[PDB]
Structure 1
Amino acid sequence: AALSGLTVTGVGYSLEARLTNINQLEMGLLIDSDVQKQGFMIPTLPPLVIV
């Protein structure tokens, strides 16, 4: 009763292949270095007095 009427047909597929570029031809992840320069300055402060 449960399987009464079911029909199953195969539709398509997808294929997984790599391109083995023995001569090499491909982009990729570049790696470089950068530098951030930052400075920190010191001020003066209001004085204490004795008279």
Structure 2
Amino acid sequence: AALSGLTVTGVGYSLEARLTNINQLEMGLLIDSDVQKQGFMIPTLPPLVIV
């Protein structure tokens, strides 16, 4: 009853395709290197004394 007059038919599809790029034509994202560098200091402190 549920499958009476029921037909299945193929319509479409897709492909998982990708290029080797032996010669390269694409770039994609880039990467950069930067250095942010800070200096640190050594104080002095008030002295101690003995008599």
* Equivalent position of 1:39 in the other structure: 39
The aligned length equals 51
Distance 1:46 1:4, change over 3 A: farther
Shift of 1:29: 1.2
Deviations 1:3-32 (A, max 9, x none): 111111100111111011111111111112
Q: What's the % identity of the aligned pairs? A: 100
TM-score (norm 1): 0.55
Q: Distance in 2 between matches of 1:15 and 1:48?
A: 81
Q: Distance in 2 between matches of 1:27 and 1:43?
A: 50
5+ residue gaps, structure 1:
none
Moved more, 24-33 or 10-19: 24-33
Root mean square deviation, CA, Å: 3.0
* Equivalent position of 1:18 in the other structure: 18
